[PDB]
Amino acid sequence: IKHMFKQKYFSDSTYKVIESLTSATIALWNKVKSTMLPTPAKFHYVFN
Description:
This protein is mostly helical. The protein contains 2 helices and no strands.
C-alpha cells in the first residue's frame, strides 16, 4: 500500500483513510470468520 500510495500524492487525508481500510478489512475478516461457520449443509463455509 505504501508503494501504491506514493504515486498521486494527492491524499491530504485519504492516506489515513487508506490505512484505516487496511485495518478495517482485517476487522471485517475477524468478525465474519468468527460469526458464521461451516455445518455439513454449508461445509465449504471456510475462511483463511
